[PDB]
Amino acid sequence: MTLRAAVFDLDGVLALPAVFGVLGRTEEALALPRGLLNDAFQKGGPEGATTRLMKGEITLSQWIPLMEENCRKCSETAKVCLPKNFSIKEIFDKAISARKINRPMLQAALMLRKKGFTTAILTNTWLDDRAERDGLAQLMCELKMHFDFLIESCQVGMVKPEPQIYKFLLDTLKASPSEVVFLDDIGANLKPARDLGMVTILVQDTDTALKELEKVTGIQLLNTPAPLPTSCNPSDMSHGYVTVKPRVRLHFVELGSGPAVCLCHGFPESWYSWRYQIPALAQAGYRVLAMDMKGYGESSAPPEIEEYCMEVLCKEMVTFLDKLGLSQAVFIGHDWGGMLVWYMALFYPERVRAVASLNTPFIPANPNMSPLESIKANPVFDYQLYFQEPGVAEAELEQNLSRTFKSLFRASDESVLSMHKVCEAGGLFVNSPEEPSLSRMVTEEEIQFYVQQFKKSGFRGPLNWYRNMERNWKWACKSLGRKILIPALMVTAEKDFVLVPQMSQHMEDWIPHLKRGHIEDCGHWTQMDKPTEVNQILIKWLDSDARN
Amino acid sequence: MTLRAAVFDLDGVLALPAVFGVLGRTEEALALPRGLLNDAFQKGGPEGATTRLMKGEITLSQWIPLMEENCRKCSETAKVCLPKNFSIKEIFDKAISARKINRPMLQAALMLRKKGFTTAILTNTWLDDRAERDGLAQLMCELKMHFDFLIESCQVGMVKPEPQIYKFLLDTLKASPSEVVFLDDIGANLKPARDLGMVTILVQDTDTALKELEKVTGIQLLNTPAPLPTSCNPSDMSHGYVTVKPRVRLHFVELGSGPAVCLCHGFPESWYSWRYQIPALAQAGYRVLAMDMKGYGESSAPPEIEEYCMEVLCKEMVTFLDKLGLSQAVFIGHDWGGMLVWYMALFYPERVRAVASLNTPFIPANPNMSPLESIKANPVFDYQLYFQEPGVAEAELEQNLSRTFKSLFRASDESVLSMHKVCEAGGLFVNSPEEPSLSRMVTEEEIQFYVQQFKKSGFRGPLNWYRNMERNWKWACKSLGRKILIPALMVTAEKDFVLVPQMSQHMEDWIPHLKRGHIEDCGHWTQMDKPTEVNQILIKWLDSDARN
């Protein structure tokens, strides 16, 4: 029984600038007797203030005075006085926020966990009731939600170097000492582990630390590539449900706090298309609500084609905002989601805090030209005609849902799905394989997630979005004298061969402060093709344009 | 066919300081030629800038310059100049926010609607893309969600005095002109109505306006009592679902934006117990999440008794926060909810932004005394023993769910449910009626809502909360050296004969900055007994203690 577990210290291992390294730092800053503070801190030993703290017996605020008091007499015996504007509260405040996640370490904990390793945190921590306690609280969710366990001293009532806590850890890990690795910055904290037969690593500089793990675990950890952003596990999400209308209920997934951000996916997808942006943006400081749009998934998908014109669709969201209590929301859409977002900007500005589109441009309708005409004047939009006749297009998509999704979600350098002559050919897939190979963009499981969803209600509803060309052309002509003068971002994908980035080139005529973003080497499925830069671009524009 | 509909102007009828009354006000403020501004505004008539605005042809920001331009030459012909620091943007900004809901008018629209009247708003409004557009956007949800319809000019493409919009209204109202009353502040806006045969009222001072309606409708509207806060319609709520654990999913209802506020109900209730506080608090500036607590309703209710000790229950919420992306939340509980909130404060401060209890005090456990002992030393807690033996208590409650809820939810001056000798008597209801009369606190329907919920999973789970006295006593003794030093409010109910307000009198010993609130003339069911003062007390403490 060799390794299958990985346990991490917090202060000094997963989170850096470690507090204790300020403990001292300060002394120096203030010409204090070397270590004075650090004695006060450890004063009493097992039966001292700081242990009681770490055990949960008392709380951070309860402890501040006991520390200061200890400090008093650490300096009385050292025949000295403290400064007269001296503050234990300030020190720890600065220190506790000063401290940020150690990124490579976390990334290595991911890497291991990605490969079957049960991961946990073991840390000597306290019950934080400081007026400013949230900052730490914030950091803990960011961490903990990447581990099997988080074991805190003040939570379990035992401390770290006391044996019984390691016993507690093993118990939690469902494991035996030789199956487990444990990293820490204090040597005293290491020894007990070993005595039971644990692999241990003294963490000093972080990346020799990694070397040791790397070796003893037999897994590239250092210098491992940049990894995809955090995905979502549907079963561990908050699912929301709003019946927006007698027989239309809309489903969404919700994570985060702050300014509401609404993500609207394109043809044939699900809220899952945003799996990479949800934790990212939530993390960046927002409340994300990722819709199943009408017709998809756990939202309702009513048969009638009218039920899917832009105008109807738009009111429904406005209701969605209504029934949730939201006066505004930032709207980011992709593919079809793109155009809808655009029409929320043009018809309900008071409701749209800011607006954002991946790939899908804004084209104002040509009030002379019919749109069934307009599409015909363009080889690549030939597929949209194929989609008009109710039923034809559905049988082909529904026929094999794996084949179908597998044939769509593929990256630029990867295709087995082409664009035109689609009506002559008489199939979207007329000339593609029955068992198409996995794209670099999707696991097998991910594809099956989609297969579940679309077993519910098929493509009738989704394919309906293409069946209101006429009505939407008309609706759209109402807005022909307007302009978008609210925060608005147009993200273009180099190699999306349908939402081509030239199509967007005049958009600044009707949107004069339009900010932009552009993804090199990116096919149509933006959010799973180039998730990280997608996240990078979006968070930055939110922060600059959507906060205040 | 006499009246059954009621239609309201916005500016000057449902919302006061009407904008146009600033239009002029300003002129005076700045020694401008009387009405100069008001001409510029109406300049062009039907074919002018302001109509296009009102029709949706263009937008507020699009219009600002056209107005200023018009203003230029209204003053050129008046042989005059404007000031050199002159701003149409500022004026309307101040004006648009200056304007608040006309309360009595809205209240009268409620009153009528409460009595079978289809209510709507008809208003000449614009597409707001001002940098500061939310303020108005905010006001509109507050209003609109109390009406059958909101009909906006720029939304329908027709304007108010043009006939075709009235036709549009009738159509929407499913009504004929003589069945409808229409209030407005402009006479021109009145006339078309009448020509089709509509009852009309020129709104000047608001309460002669009311007199007219009062009479022509034959319904007390003026001087009508203070009305209960807005309730929730379950079907028009956002329902959320978090599986917090393999087979425990927690349900909640969510409304609002801002700092998260978590409401936790007491024995045997539902998130519906907060029906009066949800819109109120949401409205006050918060994101409310009202739980079905474990054991109730659409949350999971697993059989085992352990599954309901405070410690288990607490982690589950902490998870709930986790899986929703919330670092903190304000916790307000009632009855059992009260105690749980308290233990969230004592065991997870980093997570509790602030803490609040209705009725339920904080008592620290007596580490010498057993609690099964402790309860016995008190006539009134005799019922808790009745609840210990699994099954006995459930058959009696489940036997008749109407009888049961109807027998509980009753106000102080109202009872048919007593407290003690409950074991000897051998029933909670041993001596109450089979068809108990409706309390002033509940409609019949409301009772049935509860009956639905509890048909799902009965009282096993809820009654379990009383079956971990021992375990919780133990858990609780861990916190005996701690204190609550976070924002914390103890709301006491005069006439709650079990959560008596003396029981809370030493709480300041362990909570030294505890703020308080106190409800005269209030039984145990605080939130439906005294909703308005409940809302008043809570919002004020949130604003002062929970914002920053």
Ligand SMILES: CC(C)C(=O)N1CCC(NC(=O)Nc2ccc(C(F)(F)F)cc2)CC1
């Ligand atoms: C102004 C135009 C570009 C616009 O707003 N549009 C038209 C184009 C539309 N998007 C798509 O057609 N997307 C799409 C997605 C998937 C496929 C499929 F996979 F080929 F079937 C084909 C097309 C989005 C809305």
Ligand SMILES: CC(C)C(=O)N1CCC(NC(=O)Nc2ccc(C(F)(F)F)cc2)CC1
């Ligand atoms: C410290 C004590 C007071 C405490 O925290 N407690 C004990 C009392 C408990 N609340 C109740 O017993 N509530 C209640 C509610 C309803 C009934 C019933 F309707 F009689 F059945 C009876 C009792 C709430 C938690």
Ligand SMILES: [Mg+2]
């Ligand atoms: Mg450490």
Ligand SMILES: [Mg+2]
């Ligand atoms: Mg008016």
